[PDB]
Structure 1
């Protein structure tokens, strides 16, 4: 009676757009640059590139009542940190090619 959830793509792995980076019951890894979130908190790549995991300062949305209450009660000088997953775009959006010589 067990299921498989966790990191599908580890650090430095190459992902294509739409690849599921990780599956989680709760937010253990947060969406970074070019990483989308699903309804079930699934993390997926929005661009083709290399997966990177970093530690970034956490700032919740002002309307996230539950999270805003936490940060307001923190001692001044203390910053919350979380683990974020990013995708570093490997290719350019496009190139300019000569098509005609009018």
Structure 2
């Protein structure tokens, strides 16, 4: 009487652990809901996958979570916290490796 339930796994999770070198555009982690939040130089897709916006080293950190005020449910959740409480989340950052360019001598006019 139990049908369905034959769906395969989504192969989600972290694709780049901490310290892994990541080029711009590489997907860092795919998640179904926000297990890891985007940090510095990390973007978010429609499906909440984290990709590197710059070329660098992936780092995972814990930071205080302050949601966008337009996120009404999160704002209410915060409104219900006690005074000392601060929410925390796991964030993924890309520490950019190369400089974004150098000045070169082109012509000795």
Identify the TM-score tier after normalising by the shorter chain: over 0.9
Q: Which residue of 2 aligns with 1:39?
A: 46
CA distance in 1, matches of 2:43, 2:68: 17
Q: Which has the larger radius of gyration?
A: 2
Q: Quote the offset at 1:62 in angstroms.
A: 0.9
Deviation per CA, 1:75-94: give whole Å up to 9, x if none.
00100000000000000000
Stretches of structure 1 that go unaligned for 5 or more consecutive residues are none
Q: Describe the SS at the equivalent of 1:75.
A: coil
Q: Describe the SS at the equivalent of 1:87.
A: strand
In the alignment of these two chains, the number of paired residues is 102
Structure 1 runs (4+) deviating above 6 angstroms are none
TM-score (norm 2): 0.92
Q: Quote the offset at 1:2 in angstroms.
A: 2.0
Q: CA RMSD in A?
A: 0.5
Deviation per CA, 1:35-69: give whole Å up to 9, x if none.
00000001000000000000000001111101000
Q: Quote the offset at 1:3 in angstroms.
A: 2.3
